[PDB]
Amino acid sequence: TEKKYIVGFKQTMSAMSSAKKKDVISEKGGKVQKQFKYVNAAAATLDEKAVKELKKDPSVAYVEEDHIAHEYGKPSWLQPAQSVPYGISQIKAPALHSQGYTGSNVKVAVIDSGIDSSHPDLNVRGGASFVPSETNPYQDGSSHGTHVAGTIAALNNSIGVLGVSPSASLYAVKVLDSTGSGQYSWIINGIEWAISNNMDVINMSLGGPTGSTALKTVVDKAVSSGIVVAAAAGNEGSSGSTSTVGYPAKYPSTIAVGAVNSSNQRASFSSAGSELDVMAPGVSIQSTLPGGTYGAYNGTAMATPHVAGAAALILSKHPTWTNAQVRDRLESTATYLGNSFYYGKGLINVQAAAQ
Ligand SMILES: [Ca+2]
């Protein structure tokens, strides 16, 4: 009978006590697996009939199903002296490297499937896991977070690839299992961890097709606390004038990132809509993969870290710029590429953004 939910509580005041919130859910034979820190809500398991009675309880604002998100990136092509994947030059990160700016002391949370900390071309500084039976964030079960982390911060050294912001402080925030999928509640926990740990930048190369009140809250909270939040638009293509952008990219607080190829063409699979903000390379993106290798993937998942790393570049040159200034620079120096339904403000140009 039981399904997975998020139970949102009316704002002030009760509800705000921890114990009371347990009760409202207990006394409908519900079970609570987590009360969020920044969202006035709890992740709960519930059956059919408790729901209708929860919805009736005057202290409850909503009951929504705890949704599924997934990584927006796929394998495309699968020792070596260091090369620079094209995307990095496309967004003009090298110009920042040449002024000595590479993202140092910038804290970036990779909210994904984990990051392979043993990879020689990555440096992971910390993290946590919110996937209940896959508790080590340094074991990237699906290989996706490792690839995303390489675009952001692959070491500038003698091997493999180079990240947009190669000296950025990388954090693995595991919220997708082996299968490349996560409950919305695990993602929320991931984001909450990033807030409490003072990340400067959040990267989410993942998404789901359904909205969530608790999800909006927490992404809004992160941005409100001064964190730059980049989210992949999704890979669902177009569909007339209907927006196909995924959540949380769909929320205006996040920078929604779509995919262009090396010719600056909107990629095929690249979700479109008015919630699109900027574009970045997501076709044939070379990066780090677990077990010490490299490989190319396609996805708005691979475009997003370009933006996340760009933000880290900008912050390493301009440490007093807040997320709003970084976001503004990125969007308002972007390179116009066509209709904003399709391209947003266009291709990010970290060189121009960082002037
Ligand atoms: Ca390298």
UniProtKB/Swiss-Prot annotation:
GO cellular component: extracellular region
Expression triggers: Transcribed only during stationary phase, under control of the sigma-37 factor (sigB).
Binding locations of Ca(2+) 1: 82, 121, 155, 157, 159, 161
Effect of residue 112 to N: Prevents intramolecular processing to an active enzyme
Keyword terms: Autocatalytic cleavage, Calcium, Hydrolase, Metal-binding, Protease, Secreted, Serine protease, Signal, Sporulation, Zymogen
Cofactor binding mode and count: Binds 2 calcium ions per subunit.
Domain Inhibitor I9: 4-69
Biological processes, Gene Ontology terms: proteolysis; sporulation resulting in formation of a cellular spore
Active site location: 112 (charge relay system), 144 (charge relay system), 301 (charge relay system)
Regulation: Inhibited by PMSF (phenylmethylsulphonyl fluoride) and 3,4-dichloroisocoumarin but not by EDTA (shown for strain RT-5).
Record's catalysed reaction(s): Hydrolysis of proteins with broad specificity for peptide bonds, and a preference for a large uncharged residue in P1. Hydrolyzes peptide amides
Molecular functions per Gene Ontology: metal ion binding; serine-type endopeptidase activity
Span of domain Peptidase S8: 85-354
Record Pfam families: Inhibitor_I9, Peptidase_S8
Origin superkingdom: Bacteria
Top-level EC class as recorded in UniProt: hydrolase
EC number, as in UniProt: 3.4.21.62
Domain comment in the entry: The propeptide functions as an intramolecular chaperone which is essential for the correct folding of the protease domain but is not required for enzymatic function of the folded protein. It is autoprocessed and degraded after completion of the folding process.
Function according to Swiss-Prot or TrEMBL: An extracellular alkaline serine protease, it catalyzes the hydrolysis of proteins and peptide amides.
Protein name: Subtilisin E
